[PDB]
């Protein structure tokens, strides 16, 4: 079908690589393709440069490092539960000061995990993503004292865990105070240690009235820097003997040493830009020529005093301004942990240097890599910023890599996060999405990167703009930080243009975010596209300008939850971003150069390019994702087809012809239907199921292990004690279910037997033994069985054994078996559907095709939405999408309507007018006139004022069709709906929340260790929690026995629950409940606290709830 | 100290605290018997006091005791008793219960005010011990254990047991509860109607009282066991029985949305 597109705005530059925030960063940090001598001071190189040389004698220094090739490819890592990584070798040299002997060697430091092509990692077999972390950019900031109106606070901030924060304040009494590690002291002392004299401070700081006088302490200047140093040492470290070199070491380590105190390069740059100075290093002070030389403190105090004085050219710092906040990407986050492990490694080096033979030692015997390996592994495994990859559909992964978190180590803790932090700043424009963010506790803390946004080497988010020179818009594109942005008057992208000249006398623009109308001479820059303002997901919503932000949020977030469908279709109305998403997600397979297709198969595609070389692209087929969705590629080309560079070869999951297909295009009608769509509920047609729309393949992985026990080994076998052939039917000779066998709850996936514990059989068991005549068997049936509510066809099996080549399990484990079972899920009642406009709802009914409302020509609708969802949510987009859809149904064409440069009303009116001819004129040519029912509907519409009275019925039907409303017949009666109904094609997705997964129920089951109460979760077959508030509900109802049942028989009362089950299976009434076990636990735990808790009768005598068990 | 599934061991932090205390007490005793100097015995006694402190309430005084290479403060008895995760609030004032379940809710329009659609698959498990006895009362199973072993495999389930389940739940009611439960109407008693499919059918009129809509909200179900609990549920807690808000005294079950629209 034809794709007709709209919009008058020409995008000058395309979207930058969407995953580059991960890829470019990590590549920048590793520098594997850069020759060791040309490597720069960033990354693990930086870490090596900071850590080494290691002194104390012997001096161990860093020569170079290298990264080897992965010992295993990505897929093999995924299957064998390994990590995709490269070996890290380090060439270092041991140098003796006295001897002079130089022993050089290359030691193996362990492996560094490698990032894949798409920007994710493979850690222990599972795909993971390192989420970028926003925080306050280090530097020197000045903020108004909340308590004191006319005074300010100076703040000196390094990188996280790079050393202490420092606060400079002007005290009420006039003295300048400094806070380090929650200790206040006069700044005069430290300044004296830095070598400052009353002369210097007087001539430098004298220009401000009386401010410098508080910095004047005659007793401090009376002593040389040494006495001031020891004095300061006794101030900061009471009880510590004030030896000189100890004080030197402390003050150096705190304020000076770059190995301890480290500003970021962003911190250095911001300090230089703000204070107006030039920093030698990244540290506040230096140790040079045996003394302390200041860097930061004096200019900072100068700025503080100048600001306090009211000197022009001094401003307070908005700390939520994006010029003051930076992003730590994957490279930086990994680099820091590498640095930590490296410093620990250094501690190990020194510790092993002091001991042992001082003669025979090599870098191999000195260096222990374990702390480094442990640091990195701990980072990629247990960090909060390291998240299990969401692969549900390509857009899920793509978005997940673009996430920005204020949480995690070094960042905010919840309930440390105010309203200021979570707010949308004016500087978020073009940088962070104003729309996309989680509902609930994480709002403002978790966000997403803007489409055109870029993160520079300093960590600040930059957005592209176009240079405008004298009313002429150039093609020059400048990526700016927020600070830079604040300098110019920036026109909006939708401003009228004749060629490159501004066509309007009055132009809408922004000055420091403040909206203003200006003249074309004043325009310095211009927005590239509206698209730069919103994230990738938000950019996939057509008619976004017609949707309320609150619902736009949900629509944006729900596309991440869309399940891949076997029939999946690209939307009828797209935004034009649908292809780039599939491309940059690397889900689809593309042709490298020009060439001809040699071979097309289900499992592979062979292409011969212009080079003449034969390239074979294997196709990923039915691979289970992390979220359990099937990810597989299907061939889009035929044998002998001529293809160009970048042309589509195979379609990935949730993809149609290189376009993003998150769902189906269905014919919907907006109207209440018999309370089945009541309150967001959704009615669907059975014909949706007939043609396999909203049908998705899901694969689940089941696993089981057989290990060595002190009671004897477990083993996977087909021999399972006391089981019929009917039970063992689908099991092979080894005891594992055969491929292609159907499995239902209760079926055995992998047979396993375990040696029973030391068991004293009750006389009854022995009696049964003798009775049946079969001797007691040594083992018992532990076999892995299909969980309740699950099942499918077994697609795959994997068996890893000890003693097999290339196979090594964790210690003690004999064997490990995996079973991949797949199922084809149709759309059922309880499954959740949503559109892109934030309209979400569960399918509440599936009607047969005859009950469904239908068009006059016999065409039934697929889905019935409720109009009551529209007016409160204020998302009108879904309405327009439907209208343009309607035309698209009859004209047989799709559409691209970019955000904020869209198809407007009159255009859709024209398109509907064209579609009406195909809809009606066909009927007129088939020899059919207007129906009586249509006449009645047109009468009611005349009374509704929806059509102009007096016109011919055809003209009125046209007038209705231009409003997107048509005559609809009730499937049951045949009588038309009493008014015209909005009908048309809408794009709807099936989300990941499916009733098949969520349905759970429990009678009895596993109990908790200490509390003896039911476990939680469906996975554990646990019970529902009856919390404080539910108990409050029962109490308010005054149902005492129900509540007591909840508190005793149904949870922790063991005698009570056993007797209850036994009484129920015997058909009698449930027994009186007894004391719950958790109260006993409470009593004993209170006793361990040395408090005696006694249960008493009315006569004040002890009552024993332990029944003499705890009493001697 | 219990061996988990994987064959490894899991143990409480109280064991480590007790270990510290015991070790330091033993060392104190030995140091006493060996005639140690003053300062040593002093430091040892201090350490003992801080070990008892760590055991009873950890982090109360000074920096909290942690495990080697870990920043996680160990859990003392005090931490066990109090707090949001404390024994009181977590395991006493509220509990996890047997004979319960949950699922996604869908609106039956066709239910009477006192009814709710209950999936057969759920009711099977919820009412299970009754269904066993019923299967014993009929010829469906030789005895109780045979009946229970019968329902373990889904393919071993015939049609008559479903009718047995129909006979089991007759007249009885369940409890529907949607979190959060703000007032007492967050739990209501409904006479269940067995439905095909995996979703709970909920009556439209109780929605507003539950504050429940169809966008994917889920509900929990509970089964009162006793004749007494059933009496309380049916008489007091029945949906059709409470028509008015205990707050304002105005009707809490009233026409809304589509209904008001049509009327």
């Amino acid at each position: 079908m034809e794709i007709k597109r709209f919009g008058r705005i020409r995008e000058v530059i395309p979207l930058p690589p969407l995953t580059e925030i991960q890829v470019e960063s990590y590549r920048r940090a590793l520098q594997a393709d850069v020759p060791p001598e040309k490597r720069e001071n960033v990354g693990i190189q930086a870490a090596f440069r900071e850590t080494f040389p290691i002194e104390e004698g012997l001096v161990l220094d860093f020569l170079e490092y290298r990264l080897g090739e992965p010992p295993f490819p990505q897929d093999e890592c995924r299957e064998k539960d390994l990590t995709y990584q490269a070996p890290l070798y380090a060439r270092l040299q041991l140098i003796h000061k006295d001897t002079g002997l130089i022993k050089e060697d290359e030691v193996f430091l362990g492996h560094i995990p490698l990032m894949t092509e798409d920007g994710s990692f493979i850690i222990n077999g599972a795909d993971r993503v390192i989420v970028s972390q926003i925080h306050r950019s280090p530097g020197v900031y000045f903020t108004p004292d909340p308590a004191r109106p006319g005074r300010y606070i100076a703040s000196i901030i390094p990188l996280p865990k790079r050393g202490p924060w420092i606060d400079l304040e002007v005290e009420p009494n006039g003295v300048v105070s400094m806070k380090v590690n929650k200790r206040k002291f006069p700044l005069v002392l430290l300044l004296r240690v830095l070598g400052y004299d009353q002369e210097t401070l007087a001539r430098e700081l004298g220009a401000y009235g009386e401010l410098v006088q508080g910095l004047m302490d005659e007793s401090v200047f009376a002593m040389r820097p040494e006495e001031a140093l020891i004095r300061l040492f006794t101030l900061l470290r009471p009880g510590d003997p004030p030896k000189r070199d100890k004080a030197v070491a402390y003050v150096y380590g705190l304020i000076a040493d770059p190995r301890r105190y480290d500003l970021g390069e962003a911190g250095r740059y911001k300090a230089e830009e703000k204070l107006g100075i030039r920093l030698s290093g990244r540290t506040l002070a230096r140790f040079e020529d045996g003394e302390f030389k200041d860097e930061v403190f004096l200019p900072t105090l100068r700025y503080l005093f100048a600001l306090t004085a009211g000197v022009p050219g001094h401003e307070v710092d908005d700390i939520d301004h994006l010029g003051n906040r930076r992003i730590r990407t994957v490279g930086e986050l990994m680099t820091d942990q590498f640095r930590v492990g490296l410093a620990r490694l250094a501690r190990g080096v020194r510790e092993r240097m002091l001991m042992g033979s001082e003669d025979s030692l090599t870098p191999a015997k000195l260096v222990n890599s374990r702390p480094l390996e442990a640091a990195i592994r701990e980072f990629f495994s247990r960090s909060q910023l390291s998240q299990f990859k969401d692969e549900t559909n390509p857009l899920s992964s793509l978005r997940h890599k673009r996430r920005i978190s204020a949480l995690g180590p070094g960042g905010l803790t919840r309930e440390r996060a105010g309203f200021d932090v979570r707010d949308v700043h004016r500087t978020h424009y073009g940088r962070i999405c104003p729309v996309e963010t989680p509902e609930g506790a994480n709002i403002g803390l978790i966000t997403s990167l803007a489409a055109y946004a870029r993160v520079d080497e300093l960590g600040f988010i930059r957005t592209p703009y176009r240079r405008v020179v004298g009313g002429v818009v150039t093609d020059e594109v400048v990526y700016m930080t927020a600070t830079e942005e604040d300098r110019y008057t920036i026109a909006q992208a939708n401003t009228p243009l004749e060629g490159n000249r501004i066509a309007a006398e009055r132009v809408v623009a922004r000055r420091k975010g403040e909206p203003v109308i200006v003249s074309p001479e004043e325009v310095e820059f211009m927005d590239v596209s509206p698209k730069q303002v919103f994230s990738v997901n938000t950019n996939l919503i057509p008619f976004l300008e017609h949707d309320d932000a609150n619902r736009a949020l949900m629509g944006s977030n729900m596309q991440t939850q869309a399940v891949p469908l076997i029939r999946a279709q690209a939307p009828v109305v797209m935004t034009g971003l649908e292809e780039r998403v599939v491309r940059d997600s690397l889900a689809a397979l593309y042709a490298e150069e020009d060439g001809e297709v040699a071979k097309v198969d289900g499992n592979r595609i062979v292409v011969r390019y212009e080079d003449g070389r034969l390239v074979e692209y294997p196709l990923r087929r039915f691979y289970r994702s992390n979220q359990g969705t099937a990810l597989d590629q299907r061939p889009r080309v035929v044998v002998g087809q001529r293809v160009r560079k970048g042309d589509l070869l195979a379609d990935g999951p949730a993809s149609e012809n290189g376009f993003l297909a998150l769902g189906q295009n269905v014919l919907v009608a907006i109207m209440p239907f018999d309370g089945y769509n009541f309150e967001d509920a959704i009615v669907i047609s059975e014909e949706l199921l007939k043609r396999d729309f909203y049908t998705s393949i899901h694969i689940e992985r089941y696993e089981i292990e057989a290990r060595d026990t002190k009671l004897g080994p477990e083993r996977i076998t087909r021999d399972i004690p006391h089981l019929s052939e009917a039970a063992l039917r689908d099991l092979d000779e080894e005891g594992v279910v055969r491929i292609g066998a159907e499995v239902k709850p209760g079926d055995i996936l992998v047979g396993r037997t375990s040696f029973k514990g030391e068991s004293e059989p009750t006389p009854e068991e022995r009696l049964l033994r003798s009775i049946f005549g079969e001797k007691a068997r040594d083992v018992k049936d532990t076999s892995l069985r299909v969980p309740p509510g699950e099942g499918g066809i077994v697609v795959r099996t994997v068996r890893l054994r000890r003693g097999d080549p290339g196979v090594e399990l964790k210690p003690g484990v004999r064997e490990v078996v995996r079973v991949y079972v797949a199922q084809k899920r149709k759309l059922q009642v309880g499954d959740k559907l949503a559109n892109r406009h934030g309209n979400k709802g569960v399918v509440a009914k599936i009607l047969p095709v005859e009950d469904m409302p239908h068009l006059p020509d016999g065409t039934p609708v697929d889905v019935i939405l409720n109009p009551l969802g529209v007016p409160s949510r204020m998302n009108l987009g879904q309405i327009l999408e439907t209208h343009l859809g309607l035309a698209g149904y009859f004209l047989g064409q799709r559409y691209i309507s970019p955000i904020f440069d869209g198809a407007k009303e009159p255009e859709i009116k024209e398109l509907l007018a064209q579609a009406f001819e195909v809809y009606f004129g066909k009927r007129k040519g088939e020899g059919f006139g207007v129906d009586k029912r249509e006449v009645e509907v047109l009468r009611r519409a005349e009374k509704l004022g929806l059509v102009t009275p007096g016109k011919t019925p055809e003209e009125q039907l046209k007038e209705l069709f231009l409003q997107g409303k048509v005559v609809l017949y009730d499937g049951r009666t045949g009588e038309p709906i009493e008014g015209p109904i909005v009908v048309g094609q809408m794009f709807i997705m099936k989300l990941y929340h499916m009733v098949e997964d969520k349905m759970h129920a429990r009678s009895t089951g596993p109990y908790s260790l200490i509390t003896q109460q039911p476990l939680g979760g469906k996975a554990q077959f646990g019970g529902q929690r009856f919390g404080e508030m539910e108990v409050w509900a029962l109490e308010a109802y005054g149902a005492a026995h129900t509540l007591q049942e909840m508190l005793t028989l149904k949870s922790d009362d063991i005698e009570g629950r056993n007797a209850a089950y036994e009484a129920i299976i015997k058909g009698e009434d449930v027994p009186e409940p007894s004391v719950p076990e958790s109260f006993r636990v409470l009593v004993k735990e209170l006793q361990a606290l040395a408090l005696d808790v006694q249960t008493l009768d009315e006569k004040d005598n002890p009552v024993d709830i332990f029944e003499g068990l705890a009493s001697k | 100290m219990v061996q988990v599934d994987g064959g490894r061991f899991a143990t409480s932090d109280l064991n480590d605290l007790y270990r510290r205390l015991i070790n330091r007490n033993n060392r104190l005793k030995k140091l006493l018997a060996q005639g140690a100097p003053e300062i040593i015995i002093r430091n040892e006694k201090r350490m003992l006091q801080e070990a008892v402190d760590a055991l009873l309430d950890n982090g109360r005084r000074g920096a909290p005791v942690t495990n080697p290479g870990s920043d996680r403060p160990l859990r003392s008895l005090t931490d066990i008793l109090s707090g949001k995760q404390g024994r009181f609030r977590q395991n006493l004032l509220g509990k996890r219960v047997d004979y319960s379940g949950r699922s996604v809710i869908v609106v039956g329009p066709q239910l009477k005010l006192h009814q709710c659609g209950l999936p057969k698959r759920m009711a099977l498990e919820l009412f299970k011990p009754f269904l066993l006895k019923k299967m014993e009362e009929k010829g469906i199973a030789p005895n109780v254990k045979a009946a229970r072993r019968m329902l373990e495999r889904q393919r071993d389930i015939k049609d008559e047991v479903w009718d047995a389940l129909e006979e089991v739940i007759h007249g009885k009611v369940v409890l529907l509860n949607r979190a959060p439960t703000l007032h007492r109407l967050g739990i209501q008693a409904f006479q269940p109607v067995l439905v095909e499919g995996q979703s709970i059918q909920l009556h439209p009129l109780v929605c507003e009282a539950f504050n429940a809509d169809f966008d994917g909200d889920q509900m929990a179900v509970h089964v009162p066991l006793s004749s007494f609990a059933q009496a309380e549920a049916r008489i007091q807690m029945l949906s059709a029985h409470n028509l008015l808000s205990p707050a304002s005294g105005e009707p809490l079950a009233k026409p809304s949305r589509d209904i008001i629209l049509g009327l």
Partner: peptide
């Protein structure tokens, strides 16, 4: 305050 610092102080007395 800090047990270790206290012990180190009591040690510096002798």
């Amino acid at each position: 305050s800090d047990p270790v610092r206290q012990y180190l102080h009591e040690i510096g007395q002798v």
